[model samples]
Target: QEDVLAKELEDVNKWGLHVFRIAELSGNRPLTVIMHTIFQERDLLKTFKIPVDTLITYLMTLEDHYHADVAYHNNIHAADVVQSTHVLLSTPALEAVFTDLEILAAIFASAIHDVDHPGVSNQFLINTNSELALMYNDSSVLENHHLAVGFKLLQEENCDIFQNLTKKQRQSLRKMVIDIVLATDMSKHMNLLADLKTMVETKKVTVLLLDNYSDRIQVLQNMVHCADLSNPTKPLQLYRQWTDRIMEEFFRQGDRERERGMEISPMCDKHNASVEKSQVGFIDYIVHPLWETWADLVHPDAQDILDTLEDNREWYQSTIP
Candidate 1:
């Protein structure tokens, strides 16, 4: 039965409009090897501290609760983010220095980061007085809520993915998980990078790849930041799909804001002259600055990605928002 379900999901993932960006980024069978690396680390067959099968299953269960009928920001997106985080971790200079535990934890966190996103931003939930916002008190509200929910499933009898790990291992993984998820809030862009840059500078302008856990986190924080901003780095067709989703998501939030007598997010205003221009404004002010930093860390390999981003910006520039 699970196999049947997997195949059905496979069909949808392969054909659905929303999944193209995910499929393209994962790149056919080429993504299998690295994905398996994550699966093995996340597997229940292993004696991991966290319960493996339950965690994977619980994340899959989130599909019904996701905002998009076609599963936008669903398990596929979770899988993509995890894989992207893994690929970003491949920074040549610091590969060996990062502990396997931290890598494993970061990957797991990414895989489950948005496990149950309600297809709305934190602000929307807050304005709507959603239960999650109340529970988390409006502080990076969604991320805080998601992180808490994603981890608590571990405490249940059947779903407890972390049931077998040593306390020390659990502690270490939890710390890493917290930092990575917290870094996901788009609002963290300024402080996160500033801290990373400050850490780099304080270390006498040394490469982060040379440093220890504290030193490496600067890179890791930025790495996850890059993961969130990664849509632009995707092939144009793939990248455009995310633009569509985010726009829709933004408008949904904006609509809710308008309904509740709150101000709509900038581009959410349907009457606005050019929604495209508004996005260009967002990309220029928010997205590009973050991506530019990550690309610098990787140098030439990321050059093409940066070029695509600028091209995308101009693409938006050509028309009205």
Candidate 2:
């Protein structure tokens, strides 16, 4: 017991550095791992010429805004998704075609994806018809708001993560940021999957597409989305830790939803959610299909992990209904 405690204490970092090291494989080179995770997001911004300063600044602002609690929209979530995105991007077929630009966009997008997230899904925001919902004309309310917050964070001179880009280049970067952020809305699932399938069909022969830039972008989109849902793509222990974090975050959201008199999306659902049922519903409805697409993308490379996901799904199924 003393030995285990010492080992755990030795690895901890002040800024939640230890948080990303969820699995044994993930513990080695946590920075590189985390950087790789966020680099795609950074590269995503860079692809459009967004300066790193603007991006980083935006991240800081988000931390300041969401710092109060253990869960919900905060830095750690950003860190996890960014790191997960990197690992997903590193898959063999994708490693080659993703230009530095695309990789950067993914990282940048992940870092700022939920920057100002209101701690709820797009549908919840829309159903309640919040200010953000009307602002985006009833589209993905949370997504649009996240984009606005991310870009707005750029206004702060010190927080500008993209100051280095020239004006013309900045214009291009802004557009790219908008596109990528908008793309992350899970509400866009059908369209996103459809587009991804189209790309896969176009480049069916290759594991990764090199020549077509548009196809490449679509694939990256799928990769980042997978990263977002990637809590399940690992050994059960690691996956369970992530599930805990996600559930913690969801419960917080549910609490907020309940406080505001909004209907809570099910599972890990705080406030009025039936804890057990919520977990099962989320896995059945959300986790499974997402992982299926991701497993299909990575194929044998992710087989072991996919097996774990199936096990988890079964576990959830047994208890949920």
Candidate 3:
């Protein structure tokens, strides 16, 4: 069993790592991918002095909190985003641009970004007056909850992965994680994109030059946001799998809305939704623009990613019959 897991996780560093295959190989505990990526592959265990047992306990708890019943926003999605974020950070143009603390925060934030997601959109929660919505005052409700629950898990004695960090380092990591995860909220996309665009335009430098904490955090935010929206940039089969899963989740939400005698939200009504059309539109309007700018920011390193995205867009468009 250990040998098989090792073999499957060997590809953890690749951009096309099959998260579903890993999930199956690990008996649906794909969150182990984060452990490999951060501790083994990145050597963050030594860098941060995080106790091995604490790390394991923390990741296991975080994985369990992901709600396996959710069709899309489950532990598997978190694993996918964590790996994708690592890939984004590995961009040649972005090499050595971030501190180890920042990298730790980015990876940690991605792993817990959508923890406990109910497989429903924020607007759905607000419309239903969900406790999560009221608790966060309907402002990035799910994001806030995810952060709260993720950090709260660390408070457990055996799950304090940051116990060895200096007080200032711990504070910085917390702030960075919060900023990065909060930026994952779809409502913040436009503003984040605009800031990224402006940063790129104003800098006009060959390499990313984040001189201060604000600029550094913004870049990290964009990295996580891009990873969160990176489905179309993946291999066609993986992208299709994600599309199917998200559609199922959306349809379930539509079913709930229908039961409540409310109008189904956009892209949620399975009966009226066109998978091909929606994917194409999503790629064209949302994914494409963000990734195009990201490719520009990373230059040659991300051109291949941008190419795959375009290919996926065309593939979906061709099926829009």
Candidate 4:
């Protein structure tokens, strides 16, 4: 195990750390593997005085919190986001921008951002009167639950990785994490994208970060948000695999909506929705635009990923029937 994990650590700091293979080798513990590797790569475990065993226990517990059957928003998806976030942060232009504290918050948020997902959208949960919907009042319902539960889980004695931080350090991390995770709510999509696009256009990093609720938080928001929506930005097989998995999850939701006679959700009607066409439209309307702007913000560092995105979009479009 030491040799295997050590070999993985050697490449951990690189972009595109493969969480899927780690999942296979780690036996369904991809999130643990990815997060731990990242901490080790950056010396976060030691720097933050995070106890090794405590950290592992926390991560392992966090992994189990994801619904393995969700198809898309499971532990694997969270692990993928952590890996993607790590790469996005590694962009040269951004290399020294974030402090270690910010980086830790970003990765920690990514890992538990979708904990205990019920394989249904927030809208579905609201429509079906899910307890979570009631608890969160239908406002960024799932995102709220994720942040709440994630923090609550960390309170466990062996999982309080932030136990060693000073009160102020812990407060700052908590506040930043709350903002970043809440921003991931799809309902907040346009606002996040708009600000990001505007930033890219105006080169307002300095101004935005200085006044727009601290430069670090806004950047962290965009980074984690990009990671959350990053499937189309990945290589071919991974991109296609994510599409297939999400489609399955969406189709299952559609089936439930139909069974309940709940006005079948858009794009959930598997019989009516053409997967290829939807994929193409998704890339064109949402994925491409987001990544194109992200590429703009991080330029040459992301050009290759953006190139792969184009190829993947083309491959999907060609499948149209």
lDDT of each: 0.63, 0.61, 0.90, 0.84
Stretches of candidate 1 off by over 4 Å are 1-37, 40-59, 62-72, 199-210
Question: What lDDT is reached at residue 203 by model 3?
Answer: 71
lDDT of 4: 0.84
Model 2 global lDDT (CA atoms, 0 to 1)? 0.61
lDDT of 4 at 39: 86
lDDT of 4 by residue, 1-321 (tens): 757755765666665566566777788888998888888877998889999999999999888889888899899899888888887878877756777888889988998899998889999999999999999898999999899889998887799999999999999899989999998998887888898877777775441232445556877898899899888877777777888998999999999999998898888998888888888898898888888888888776788888988998999888885
* Candidate closest to the true structure, highest lDDT: 3
- Tens digits of lDDT, candidate 2, 26-82: 432232234433444344554545455554455556555544455545555666667
Lowest lDDT 10-mer window, candidate 3? 32-41
**Between the candidate structures 2 and 3, which one is better when assessed by lDDT?**
3
Rank ordering of all candidates by TM-score, starting from the highest: 3, 4, 1, 2
Clashes of each: 11, 30, 0, 1
Q: So what's the TM-score on candidate 1? A: 0.78
| Local lDDT at 133 for model 1 | 84
Error of 3 at 273 (Å): 0.9
lDDT of 3 at 278: 90
RMSD of 1: 5.4
